[PDB]
Copies of this chain bind each other. A is one copy, B any other.
Amino acid sequence: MKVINDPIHGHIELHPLLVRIIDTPQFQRLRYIKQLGGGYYVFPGASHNRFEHSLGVGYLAGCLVHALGEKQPELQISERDVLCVQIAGLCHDLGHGPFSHMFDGRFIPLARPEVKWTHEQGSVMMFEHLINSNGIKPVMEQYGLIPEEDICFIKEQIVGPLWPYKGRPENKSFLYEIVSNKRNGIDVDKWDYFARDCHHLGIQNNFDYKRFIKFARVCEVDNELRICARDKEVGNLYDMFHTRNSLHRRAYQHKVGNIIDTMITDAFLKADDYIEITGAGGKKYRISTAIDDMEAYTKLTDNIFLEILYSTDPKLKDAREILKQIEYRNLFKYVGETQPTIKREDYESLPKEVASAKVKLKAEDFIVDVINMDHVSFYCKTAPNRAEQLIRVYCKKVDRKSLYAARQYFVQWCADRNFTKP
């Protein structure tokens, strides 16, 4: 039983099987992916990576499952189930690319509009490669799990359905709500990064998971088992959504923060053809091509930022000069924001529309970013166990002649595309 020292969670004990998963080139790969991505460049405190977050989600998953189990033994929660929810919360973020969310959502739609790709899909594909290349299946059976059935349970917790779920039957439905919960917006993953980003950004985090877990119970609602909260402890939830909202409004949706994200994205596109990443069978993959092979994708981390920056190859000159501008602080200028009163595939066309909306501006000077941002069941003391899209535009030309021009092309772009007035 290994223990790791955490600033947020204190002491995290790791069952030897988890450790076997952690000590792998596929999981250690997460030491090199900044959580907030571009956000480190606006908030100097936020250097932290996905690796230390993963241990957080794994810890919390174990905290929620074990705690529900002792509170409600009739849930028939086995020791085998506990590792499965842990291992799932642990490998949830295996698929994240360079700078986390910048990759799946901003870059790939631009580099390869054709492909439907998410980081959740990557986490599943990576998880298999982790198991296959390190031979974890026998170790799983060594600690009392059944690999054929449990690996399916784990993959479903991460990506979702491949009664929908094949890993566990409907009586243990609540288990799916622990690591990734889409309906409620309550999962041990958020509790980690909600608490974890606040620790680093310098914001007070009001939500207390230790108390929520204290008063959490599995209950019947609409003929389905879901995880529910106490009625007296509803105040703890309201601070979560505000903490959830503060973190979005301030950090994730920061004017400068997502701007640096697009500059980096912009350089990657400029570097995609020329930079090669070695994969399976010695096949060379480009930056956009890497997500196909997990052997190659294992190599793709935040390293890619610095190799362009440090590159001497003239083939990488245009991409490098964009990254140089980040370090000298000569950024893209902000034009305006709007709302759809859009799909990722269609991101491709968005700059082409603004240049031709009617000093001359072309598409090459236009960057357009798309940002994407009760339902809680409750039990009672007397009767327990009873129940946007924001669109911004930036410009590559900084001078005050080209920038005014950019705004009106933008304003008409909004008018004909029937959005709100900027």
Q: A303-B310, A310-B303 are in contact. Are A47 and B52 (CB under 8 A)?
A: yes
A306 to B306, CA, bound (A): 10
Given contacts A10-B211, A307-B307, contact A204 B204 (CB under 8 A): yes
Given contacts A306-B303, A310-B299, contact A327 B28 (CB under 8 A): yes
Contact with B along A24-35 (1 / 0, CB 8 A): 110010011000
Q: Given that A6-B202, A201-B5 are contacting pairs, would A307 and B312 also be in contact in the complex, using a CB cutoff of 8 Å?
A: no
Q: Which residues of B contact A301 (CB under 8 A)?
A: 306
Is A44 engaged at the interface, CB distance under 8 Å to the other chain?
yes
Could you tell me if A328 and B23 are in contact, using CB atoms closer than 8 angstroms? yes
CA distance A42 to B55 in the complex (A): 13
From A54, which residue of chain B is reached at the shortest CB distance? B44
Closest Cβ of chain B: how far from A306's Cβ, in Å? Answer: 4
Contact yes or no, B235 A45, CB < 8 A: no
Bound CA–CA A31/B47 (angstroms): 9
Q: List residues of A (1-57) whose CB comes within 8 Å of B's CBs.
A: 3-8, 10-11, 23-25, 28, 31-32, 40-45, 47-49, 51-52, 55
**Contact residues in B for A55 (Cβ distance below 8 Å):** 44
The 8 Å CB contact of A204, one of B239, B277, B307, is B239
CA distance A309 to B303 in the complex (A): 10
Interface mask (A185-207 → B, CB under 8 Å = 1, otherwise 0): 00000000000000111111010
Cβ of A239 and Cβ of B235 under 8 Å apart?
Answer: no
CB of A329 within 8 A of CB of B51, answer no
Docked-complex contact A43 and B199, CB < 8 angstroms: no
Q: Which of B24, B40, B51, B246 contacts A44 (CB 8 A)?
A: B51
A-B contacts, 5 listed (Cβ < 8 Å): A5-B44, A25-B324, A25-B328, A44-B52, A238-B245
